[PDB]
Each structure stands twice: as C-alpha cells, then as structure tokens.
PDB file of N, CA and C in Angstrom:
ATOM      1  N   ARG A  15       0.846  -1.227   0.000  1.00 10.03           N
ATOM      2  CA  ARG A  15       0.000   0.000   0.000  1.00 10.03           C
ATOM      3  C   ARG A  15       0.867   1.257   0.000  1.00 10.03           C
ATOM      4  N   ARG A  16       0.368   2.329  -0.605  1.00 12.54           N
ATOM      5  CA  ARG A  16       1.106   3.589  -0.648  1.00 12.54           C
ATOM      6  C   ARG A  16       0.791   4.445   0.588  1.00 12.54           C
ATOM      7  N   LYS A  17       0.887   5.762   0.430  1.00 14.06           N
ATOM      8  CA  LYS A  17       0.599   6.698   1.517  1.00 14.06           C
ATOM      9  C   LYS A  17      -0.914   6.758   1.797  1.00 14.06           C
ATOM     10  N   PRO A  18      -1.310   7.127   3.031  1.00 15.80           N
ATOM     11  CA  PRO A  18      -2.728   7.221   3.433  1.00 15.80           C
ATOM     12  C   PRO A  18      -3.589   8.066   2.480  1.00 15.80           C
ATOM     13  N   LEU A  19      -4.894   7.755   2.448  1.00 16.28           N
ATOM     14  CA  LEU A  19      -5.868   8.449   1.588  1.00 16.28           C
ATOM     15  C   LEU A  19      -5.621   8.153   0.105  1.00 16.28           C
ATOM     16  N   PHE A  20      -6.380   7.184  -0.426  1.00 16.10           N
ATOM     17  CA  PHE A  20      -6.282   6.756  -1.829  1.00 16.10           C
ATOM     18  C   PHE A  20      -4.997   5.964  -2.091  1.00 16.10           C
ATOM     19  N   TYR A  21      -5.158   4.663  -2.297  1.00 17.78           N
ATOM     20  CA  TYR A  21      -4.037   3.762  -2.566  1.00 17.78           C
ATOM     21  C   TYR A  21      -3.601   3.824  -4.048  1.00 17.78           C
ATOM     22  N   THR A  22      -3.371   2.669  -4.680  1.00 14.97           N
ATOM     23  CA  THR A  22      -2.962   2.638  -6.089  1.00 14.97           C
ATOM     24  C   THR A  22      -4.101   3.109  -7.004  1.00 14.97           C
ATOM     25  N   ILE A  23      -3.776   3.996  -7.937  1.00 14.92           N
ATOM     26  CA  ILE A  23      -4.772   4.553  -8.857  1.00 14.92           C
ATOM     27  C   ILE A  23      -5.149   3.575  -9.987  1.00 14.92           C
ATOM     28  N   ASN A  24      -5.655   2.403  -9.617  1.00 15.13           N
ATOM     29  CA  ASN A  24      -6.076   1.397 -10.600  1.00 15.13           C
ATOM     30  C   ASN A  24      -7.433   1.760 -11.212  1.00 15.13           C
ATOM     31  N   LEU A  25      -7.490   2.928 -11.861  1.00 12.80           N
ATOM     32  CA  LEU A  25      -8.720   3.431 -12.488  1.00 12.80           C
ATOM     33  C   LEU A  25      -9.836   3.601 -11.451  1.00 12.80           C
ATOM     34  N   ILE A  26      -9.447   4.007 -10.244  1.00 14.15           N
ATOM     35  CA  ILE A  26     -10.394   4.203  -9.151  1.00 14.15           C
ATOM     36  C   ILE A  26     -11.332   5.394  -9.408  1.00 14.15           C
ATOM     37  N   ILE A  27     -10.787   6.490  -9.942  1.00 11.27           N
ATOM     38  CA  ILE A  27     -11.582   7.687 -10.233  1.00 11.27           C
ATOM     39  C   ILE A  27     -12.775   7.370 -11.155  1.00 11.27           C
ATOM     40  N   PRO A  28     -12.538   6.892 -12.404  1.00 12.34           N
ATOM     41  CA  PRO A  28     -13.626   6.546 -13.329  1.00 12.34           C
ATOM     42  C   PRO A  28     -14.600   5.539 -12.712  1.00 12.34           C
ATOM     43  N   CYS A  29     -14.060   4.553 -11.991  1.00  8.61           N
ATOM     44  CA  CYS A  29     -14.884   3.538 -11.328  1.00  8.61           C
ATOM     45  C   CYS A  29     -15.843   4.184 -10.325  1.00  8.61           C
ATOM     46  N   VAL A  30     -15.318   5.083  -9.492  1.00  6.95           N
ATOM     47  CA  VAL A  30     -16.119   5.782  -8.513  1.00  6.95           C
ATOM     48  C   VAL A  30     -17.168   6.668  -9.196  1.00  6.95           C
ATOM     49  N   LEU A  31     -16.737   7.431 -10.202  1.00  6.65           N
ATOM     50  CA  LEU A  31     -17.644   8.306 -10.947  1.00  6.65           C
ATOM     51  C   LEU A  31     -18.772   7.504 -11.599  1.00  6.65           C
ATOM     52  N   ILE A  32     -18.415   6.440 -12.322  1.00  5.67           N
ATOM     53  CA  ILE A  32     -19.409   5.586 -12.972  1.00  5.67           C
ATOM     54  C   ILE A  32     -20.357   4.975 -11.937  1.00  5.67           C
ATOM     55  N   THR A  33     -19.793   4.479 -10.834  1.00  6.85           N
ATOM     56  CA  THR A  33     -20.601   3.895  -9.759  1.00  6.85           C
ATOM     57  C   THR A  33     -21.562   4.939  -9.190  1.00  6.85           C
ATOM     58  N   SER A  34     -21.040   6.143  -8.936  1.00  9.51           N
ATOM     59  CA  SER A  34     -21.848   7.244  -8.408  1.00  9.51           C
ATOM     60  C   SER A  34     -23.007   7.571  -9.348  1.00  9.51           C
ATOM     61  N   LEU A  35     -22.702   7.760 -10.635  1.00  8.16           N
ATOM     62  CA  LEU A  35     -23.730   8.060 -11.627  1.00  8.16           C
ATOM     63  C   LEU A  35     -24.761   6.932 -11.699  1.00  8.16           C
ATOM     64  N   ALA A  36     -24.278   5.687 -11.734  1.00  8.62           N
ATOM     65  CA  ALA A  36     -25.170   4.535 -11.786  1.00  8.62           C
ATOM     66  C   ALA A  36     -26.110   4.526 -10.593  1.00  8.62           C
ATOM     67  N   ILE A  37     -25.561   4.507  -9.382  1.00  5.19           N
ATOM     68  CA  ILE A  37     -26.385   4.522  -8.163  1.00  5.19           C
ATOM     69  C   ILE A  37     -27.340   5.721  -8.164  1.00  5.19           C
ATOM     70  N   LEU A  38     -26.862   6.877  -8.627  1.00  6.35           N
ATOM     71  CA  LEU A  38     -27.702   8.073  -8.701  1.00  6.35           C
ATOM     72  C   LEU A  38     -28.941   7.807  -9.565  1.00  6.35           C
ATOM     73  N   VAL A  39     -28.730   7.185 -10.724  1.00  2.77           N
ATOM     74  CA  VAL A  39     -29.831   6.851 -11.636  1.00  2.77           C
ATOM     75  C   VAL A  39     -30.591   5.595 -11.173  1.00  2.77           C
ATOM     76  N   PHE A  40     -29.823   4.573 -10.825  1.00  2.10           N
ATOM     77  CA  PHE A  40     -30.332   3.274 -10.376  1.00  2.10           C
ATOM     78  C   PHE A  40     -31.163   3.363  -9.093  1.00  2.10           C
ATOM     79  N   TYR A  41     -30.596   3.973  -8.063  1.00  2.26           N
ATOM     80  CA  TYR A  41     -31.274   4.113  -6.778  1.00  2.26           C
ATOM     81  C   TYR A  41     -32.233   5.303  -6.776  1.00  2.26           C
ATOM     82  N   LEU A  42     -31.830   6.382  -7.451  1.00  4.98           N
ATOM     83  CA  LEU A  42     -32.634   7.602  -7.547  1.00  4.98           C
ATOM     84  C   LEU A  42     -32.965   8.188  -6.165  1.00  4.98           C
ATOM     85  N   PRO A  43     -31.948   8.702  -5.443  1.00  3.78           N
ATOM     86  CA  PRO A  43     -32.138   9.289  -4.104  1.00  3.78           C
ATOM     87  C   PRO A  43     -32.875  10.639  -4.122  1.00  3.78           C
ATOM     88  N   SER A  44     -34.063  10.660  -4.715  1.00  2.87           N
ATOM     89  CA  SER A  44     -34.866  11.881  -4.795  1.00  2.87           C
ATOM     90  C   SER A  44     -35.596  12.161  -3.479  1.00  2.87           C
ATOM     91  N   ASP A  45     -35.760  13.445  -3.153  1.00  3.07           N
ATOM     92  CA  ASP A  45     -36.443  13.859  -1.921  1.00  3.07           C
ATOM     93  C   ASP A  45     -37.960  13.622  -2.002  1.00  3.07           C
ATOM     94  N   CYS A  46     -38.346  12.368  -2.198  1.00  4.11           N
ATOM     95  CA  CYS A  46     -39.751  11.987  -2.304  1.00  4.11           C
ATOM     96  C   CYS A  46     -39.928  10.500  -1.992  1.00  4.11           C
ATOM     97  N   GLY A  47     -40.947  10.177  -1.200  1.00  3.91           N
ATOM     98  CA  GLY A  47     -41.175   8.794  -0.810  1.00  3.91           C
ATOM     99  C   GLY A  47     -42.200   8.039  -1.651  1.00  3.91           C
ATOM    100  N   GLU A  48     -42.114   8.133  -2.975  1.00  4.17           N
ATOM    101  CA  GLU A  48     -43.049   7.397  -3.832  1.00  4.17           C
ATOM    102  C   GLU A  48     -42.506   5.989  -4.103  1.00  4.17           C
ATOM    103  N   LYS A  49     -41.179   5.890  -4.182  1.00  4.63           N
ATOM    104  CA  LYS A  49     -40.496   4.620  -4.436  1.00  4.63           C
ATOM    105  C   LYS A  49     -40.515   3.706  -3.201  1.00  4.63           C
TER     106      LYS A  49
END
C-alpha cells in the first residue's frame, strides 16, 4: 500500500464516478417517498 488516503490509482476515479452516476440513476435518491 502507498501513503494514506487513496491507494494505487487502478482506475479508481472513473470507477467511482461511474458507480456514483449509476447509483444516482439506479437508486434515484430523490427527496420523495413514492419509491
């Protein structure tokens, strides 16, 4: 492991961004309790 806060940059940024966008669309954390 490298220095604290974020280890090896094995495409972690794009992975996190894609995951975030997916969950955002997939889960849809909208301020409404219809789901």
